[PDB]
Design an enzyme around this catalytic site. Structure first.
Site, short mmCIF file in Angstrom:
data_model
loop_
_atom_site.label_atom_id
_atom_site.label_comp_id
_atom_site.label_asym_id
_atom_site.label_seq_id
_atom_site.Cartn_x
_atom_site.Cartn_y
_atom_site.Cartn_z
N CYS A 106 42.44 42.89 41.91
CA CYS A 106 41.94 41.61 41.48
C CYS A 106 42.17 40.50 42.52
O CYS A 106 43.30 40.20 42.90
CB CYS A 106 42.67 41.22 40.19
SG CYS A 106 42.12 39.65 39.47
N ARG A 109 44.18 36.53 41.29
CA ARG A 109 45.53 36.41 40.77
C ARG A 109 46.25 35.10 41.12
O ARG A 109 47.34 34.85 40.61
CB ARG A 109 46.36 37.59 41.25
CG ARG A 109 45.91 38.95 40.74
CD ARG A 109 46.79 40.00 41.35
NE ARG A 109 46.17 40.53 42.54
CZ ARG A 109 46.73 41.41 43.35
NH1 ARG A 109 47.97 41.80 43.09
NH2 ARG A 109 46.07 41.86 44.45
C1 HEM Z 1 39.88 33.96 36.64
C2 HEM Z 1 39.20 34.44 37.69
C3 HEM Z 1 39.12 35.95 38.03
C4 HEM Z 1 38.43 36.46 39.05
C5 HEM Z 1 37.57 35.64 40.03
C6 HEM Z 1 38.57 37.91 39.06
C7 HEM Z 1 37.96 38.74 39.96
C8 HEM Z 1 37.99 40.10 40.03
C9 HEM Z 1 37.18 40.95 40.90
C10 HEM Z 1 36.10 40.51 41.92
C11 HEM Z 1 37.52 42.22 40.66
C12 HEM Z 1 36.92 43.47 41.37
C13 HEM Z 1 36.12 44.35 40.40
C14 HEM Z 1 34.64 44.49 40.73
O1 HEM Z 1 34.08 43.72 41.56
O2 HEM Z 1 34.00 45.41 40.12
C15 HEM Z 1 38.55 42.19 39.66
C16 HEM Z 1 39.19 43.27 39.14
C17 HEM Z 1 40.20 43.18 38.21
N1 HEM Z 1 40.62 42.07 37.53
FE1 HEM Z 1 40.37 40.11 38.11
N2 HEM Z 1 39.41 38.25 38.03
C18 HEM Z 1 39.76 37.08 37.37
C19 HEM Z 1 40.57 37.02 36.24
C20 HEM Z 1 41.24 38.14 35.78
C21 HEM Z 1 42.11 38.17 34.63
C22 HEM Z 1 42.40 36.97 33.68
C23 HEM Z 1 42.59 39.43 34.53
C24 HEM Z 1 43.56 39.98 33.47
C25 HEM Z 1 44.47 39.17 32.93
C26 HEM Z 1 42.03 40.21 35.59
C27 HEM Z 1 42.32 41.52 35.81
C28 HEM Z 1 41.66 42.39 36.67
C29 HEM Z 1 41.94 43.79 36.76
C30 HEM Z 1 43.02 44.61 36.04
C31 HEM Z 1 40.98 44.30 37.81
C32 HEM Z 1 40.85 45.72 38.32
C33 HEM Z 1 39.66 46.29 37.57
C34 HEM Z 1 39.47 47.71 37.99
O3 HEM Z 1 40.43 48.32 38.57
O4 HEM Z 1 38.34 48.23 37.71
N3 HEM Z 1 41.17 39.42 36.33
N4 HEM Z 1 38.83 40.90 39.28
#
Ligand code: HEM
Ligand code: HEM
Ligand SMILES: Cc1cc(N)nc(C[C@H]2CNC[C@@H]2NCCNCCc2cccc(F)c2)c1
Ligand SMILES: Cc1cc(N)nc(C[C@H]2CNC[C@@H]2NCCNCCc2cccc(F)c2)c1
Ligand SMILES: C[C@H](O)[C@H](O)[C@H]1CNc2nc(N)[nH]c(=O)c2N1
Ligand SMILES: C[C@H](O)[C@H](O)[C@H]1CNc2nc(N)[nH]c(=O)c2N1
Ligand SMILES: [Zn+2]
Lengths: 407, 411
Positions: A106, A109
Site C-alpha cells: 500500500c 500508509r
Molecule cells: C487513503 C488512501 C489510500 C491509497 C491511495 C491506497 C492505495 C493503494 C494502492 C495503489 C494499492 C495497490 C493495489 C493495486 O493497485 O491493485 C493498495 C493496496 C493495498 N492497500 Fe492501500 N490505499 C489507501 C488506503 C488504504 C487503507 C485505509 C487500507 C486499510 C486500512 C489500505 C490497505 C491496503 C492493503 C492491505 C493493500 C494490498 C492489497 C493487495 O495486496 O492486494 N489502503 N493501496
C-alpha cells in the site's frame, strides 16, 4: 542483521532494523526470488496473543507494568478455557491501524494513524451486516470528502461460522458474457456477477451496473442487498480540453473499499473486515480502463484523438494513456471528490518511509506494487530501494467463499 | 520441485524446472525479499567443480555428453589446473560461454537475440594500445553504419588478480559531465567523477554538453592509458520531433551504440574482467532514463515549458505528457536516420515470446521484474502482467568494483 536501503536519485541511505521483528515467510529463498509472484489451535493462539499484547503495551509506554502483566494472564486464562479470546476496543483500534501500517503493498500508509474503526463484533445476521456496511459507505464517502474507515465483523470461531462479504469490493460494476464473445461491463467480475444472477439478482445488463452486496453471517447461506443508490457516489468521466471525451460514456465510483481480505490480530482472524480510503488516479485510469482484461478502452480513445495506430512506435498507447488519466483526475477534482495523482501519492509515501525509518527503524515495502503502473521512473519511489517483509497484525488474502462455503 | 508462474492477463501458467540448476545466492531470505536492492583470485580447490559443471553443460548442448571427446577434455582441464592453477577455454567453449552469460542475464529484456552474438576473442592482447585497437574494431563492426549488430570482445581472464585487464569506462561511448563551481552540471551528471579521472590522466576536455569521453584502458594490471575513439567511428543521432519544430533547438543528440564495458564475465570458474558487449537501444533507456531522470540531463522542465503545459499542479500530469513526447522524438530521430532502435512495446512483447519459448525448450527463464518492466507505461506492456522467477545461472555477467577504487598505482 542491519540492512541499508539507498535512494539512487538522492543518495540518501537508511538502516532497517524492523525486519528482525518479522515473523512470517516471504516466498523467497537464497536460491530464488519470488517478488513478482502475486500470491506465493490453543497451542498456537497464546504465543500470537502474547506477541501482539507485548507490542501494544510497549506502544502505550507501559511495557512490563502491572496493567500489562494482568491483561497477559487474563488472555491466557480465556484461551485455556474458551479456545479463543476477545480484544479490548483499544487493542482492536491499535490492531487495525497497525495492520494498515504493515501493508507493504500500500502506497497510502502515510495516513495510517487516522483510520476510523467501526466495531461490528456484536453483529449476528446479514441484514445487520448490510446496516453496518451502509453506515460505513456513508461515513467514508462524506459527500465526496472521503475518510479512511474499516468495519470489523465478528472473528472466526470453528471456521464453519464465518462472516464474509463475498464481493471483492463493496462497490463494483457487473460483468456479463455476451452472444458475440465480447464482454459487457467489467470482465474482472463475470464469475461473481453470475453468482448474483443465480442468487436472484435482476441484472440491468449495462456497462456500469453497481453490483449487489452478498453477505454471509455466521456461516449461513449468503444474501443479496442493493446499496441504496443515493449512497454510491459516482463521477462521470470528461476531459478538460477534449470535448468528445464525454460520449465514451465513462464513469467511476468514488469509493474504493476492499472487502475480501482477512485481518489477523494477535492470532485472531477477522474474515469480514471491509476497509476503504480513496483512489490514486492511475488505479482507475491505467488499470480499470486500460488493462487488456478490464474495460480496455485504449483502442477507442486513440481513435478519437486521430493518432497513428499503424505502428507501435508512434507511442499512441502512451499518448492516449496520459489523456485518459488526465481526464480521471480532472473529473474527480471538478466534482470535489478526493483523489490523489501518482506523483503526489509517491512523494508522500517517500516522506512516510523516511518517517518510519527514524521512528520505527524501517518500513516494509513491496516495490513491484508501490511503483505506479505508468511513468514509473519519474516518480521518486522508482529509485528507492525497499525491503519487503511480513509483520503482524496484517491483512492477508483468503480463499473465495464460493469455492469453499457449503450450501 | 516445479514452480508455476502465471500471466495475469492471459491466464497462461508455465512451469520452471530450470531454477534447480542454480547455485549462487540471491540476497533474499525466507524472512526477507531484496528483489529491489540494486546490488545485494581463486584457489585450485574451487576451480575444477566449476570447470566440470560448465563443460558438462557445454557438452550436453552439443549432444556429446559422456563422449570420448568430453571425458578427454575434462581430464585435460583437470591436468592443466593442477599444473598451472588456471585453464584456457577452447574457442568454441568461449563462444558458448558468452552466449549463455547473455541468455542467463535476468535483468536484460533483450535476450531473444541471445544466440546471434558475435564473439571477438582478444585473449592475445597484451597492451593498452592493443586494447584500443580491438575496441575500435568492435565498435565499427557493431555499428555497421546504423544497422547495429550485437557483439562482445573478450580480453584475457584474471590470473592472480594482480594482472587484470580493465576498461575503466562504464560504457565505450558516453558523454563527459563536469561539476561547475556553482553546483550545476554540464553534460551527463552520471559521468562526473570518471570525467575528472580522465582529466587527471591528461585529457584536455572540450567542456561541451555532449563530449564523447576517451577510453581509459588498463592492460595486464598496468596503470591505464588514454585514447580518443575516432569520431568517424562514433555514430550519433540529433534529436528531433515529428511534429514539434522547436524540439531540435533544444540541442539534444545521442550516440547509437550502447556498449557496456564494466562487467565481469564468468565462465567455468574463469573471470574475464574486461568484456565490453554491445547491442542496440530500447527507446526508453535514452528517453526516460538518460534525458528525464533528475540525476541525468533532466530536460522534463525545459520540454514542458516549451509545450506550455500547466506546470503549476502535478495533477495536470505535465510530466507524463512531456515524457511521452520526448520518447516519441527519440524513436522518430533514430528510425529517420536508419539507426536500429526498439520501442518498449515491441521489446517487451518480444521478450514475452522469448520467455515462453525458454520455458518449453529450457524449462525456465530467469527474469528480474523490477528491471524488465520499462520505466514508463508499465502496465500497458505485457511483461507487467507476467510473473517472473529470478535466479542466478552460470555463465554470468557480474558487477565489479570500479577500478580507481581497487587499482594499485605504479607511477
Ligand atoms: C487513503 C488512501 C489510500 C491509497 C491511495 C491506497 C492505495 C493503494 C494502492 C495503489 C494499492 C495497490 C493495489 C493495486 O493497485 O491493485 C493498495 C493496496 C493495498 N492497500 Fe492501500 N490505499 C489507501 C488506503 C488504504 C487503507 C485505509 C487500507 C486499510 C486500512 C489500505 C490497505 C491496503 C492493503 C492491505 C493493500 C494490498 C492489497 C493487495 O495486496 O492486494 N489502503 N493501496
Ligand atoms: C541488442 C539489444 C539489447 C537490448 C534492447 C537490451 C536491453 C537491456 C535493458 C533495457 C537493460 C536494463 C538496463 C537498464 O535499464 O539500466 C539491459 C540490461 C542488461 N543487458 Fe541487455 N540488451 C540488449 C543486448 C544485450 C547484449 C549484447 C548483452 C550482453 C552480451 C546484454 C546483456 C545485458 C546484461 C548482462 C544486463 C544487466 C545490466 C545490469 O544489471 O546493470 N544485452 N538490457
Ligand atoms: C483501501 C484501498 C484504497 C485504494 N486507493 N486502493 C486499494 C486497492 C484496491 C483498489 N484497486 C485494486 C485494489 N484491490 C486490492 C485487491 N487486489 C487484487 C489483486 C489480486 C487479484 C486476483 C488474485 C489475487 F490473489 C490478487 C485499496
Ligand atoms: C548491451 C546493452 C543493450 C542495451 N540496449 N542496454 C544495455 C544496458 C545499459 C544501457 N542503458 C543503461 C544500461 N546500463 C548498463 C548497466 N549498468 C547499470 C546498473 C547499475 C547501476 C548502478 C549500480 C549498480 F550496481 C548497477 C546494454
Ligand atoms: C505479475 C505481477 O506480479 C502483477 O502484474 C502485479 C505487478 N504489480 C502490481 N502492482 C499493483 N499496484 N497492483 C497490481 O495488481 C500489480 N500486479
Ligand atoms: C531501487 C531500484 O531497484 C532501482 O532504482 C532500479 C529499479 N529498476 C530499474 N530497471 C532498469 N531497467 N534500470 C534501472 O536502472 C533500474 N533501477
Ligand atoms: Zn525476493
Amino acid at each position: 542483521r542491519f540492512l541499508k536501503v539507498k535512494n539512487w536519485e538522492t543518495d540518501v541511505v537508511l538502516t532497517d532494523t524492523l525486519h528482525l521483528k518479522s515473523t512470517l515467510e516471504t516466498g523467497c529463498t537464497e536460491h530464488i526470488c519470488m517478488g513478482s509472484i502475486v500470491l506465493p489451535t490453543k497451542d498456537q493462539l497464546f504465543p500470537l496473543a502474547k506477541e501482539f499484547l507485548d507490542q501494544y503495551y510497549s506502544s502505550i509506554k507501559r511495557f512490563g507494568s502491572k496493567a500489562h502483566m494482568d491483561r497477559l494472564e487474563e488472555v491466557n486464562k480465556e484461551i485455556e478455557s474458551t479456545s479463543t479470546y476477545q480484544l479490548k476496543d483499544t487493542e482492536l483500534i491499535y490492531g487495525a491501524k497497525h495492520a494498515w501500517r504493515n501493508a507493504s503493498r500500500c502506497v497510502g500508509r502515510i495516513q495510517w494513524s487516522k483510520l476510523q474503526v467501526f466495531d461490528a463484533r456484536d453483529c449476528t445476521t446479514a441484514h445487520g451486516m448490510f446496516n453496518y456496511i451502509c453506515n460505513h459507505v456513508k461515513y467514508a464517502t462524506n459527500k465526496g470528502n472521503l475518510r479512511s474507515a474499516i468495519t470489523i465483523f465478528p472473528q472466526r470461531t470453528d471456521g464453519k461460522h464465518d462472516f464474509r462479504v463475498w464481493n471483492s469490493q463493496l462497490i463494483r460494476y457487473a460483468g456479463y458474457k455476451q452472444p458475440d464473445g465480447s464482454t459487457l461491463g467489467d470482465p474482472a467480475n463475470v464469475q461473481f456477477t453470475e453468482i448474483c444472477i443465480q442468487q436472484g439478482w435482476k441484472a440491468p445488463r449495462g456497462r456500469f451496473d453497481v453490483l449487489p452486496l452478498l453477505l454471509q453471517a455466521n456461516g449461513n447461506d449468503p444474501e443479496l442487498f442493493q446499496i441504496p443508490p443515493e449512497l454510491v457516489l459516482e463521477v462521470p468521466i470528461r476531459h478538460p480540453k477534449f470535448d468528445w471525451f464525454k460520449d465514451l460514456g465513462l464513469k467511476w465510483y468514488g469509493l474504493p473499499a476492499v472487502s475480501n481480505m482477512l485481518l489477523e490480530i494477535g492470532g485472531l482472524e477477522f474474515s469480514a473486515c471491509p476497509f476503504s480510503g480513496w483512489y490514486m488516479g492511475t488505479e482507475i485510469g491505467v488499470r480499470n480502463y486500460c488493462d487488456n482484461s478490464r474495460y480496455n478502452i485504449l483502442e477507442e480513445v486513440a481513435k478519437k484523438m486521430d493518432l497513428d495506430m499503424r505502428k507501435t512506435s508512434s507511442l499512441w498507447k502512451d499518448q492516449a494513456l496520459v489523456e485518459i488519466n488526465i481526464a480521471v483526475l480532472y473529473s474527480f477534482q471538478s466534482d470535489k471528490v478526493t483523489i490523489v495523482d501518482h506523483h503526489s501519492a509517491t512523494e508522500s509515501f517517500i516522506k512516510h518511509m523516511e518517517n518510519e525509518y527514524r521512528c520505527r527503524g524501517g518500513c516494509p515495502a513491496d516495490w513491484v506494487w508501490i511503483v505506479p503502473p505508468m511513468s514509473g521512473s519519474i516518480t521518486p519511489v522508482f529509485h528507492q530501494e525497499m525491503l519487503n517483509y511480513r509483520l503482524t497484525p496484517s491483512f492477508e488474502y483468503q480463499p473465495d467463499p464460493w469455492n469453499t462455503h457449503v450450501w
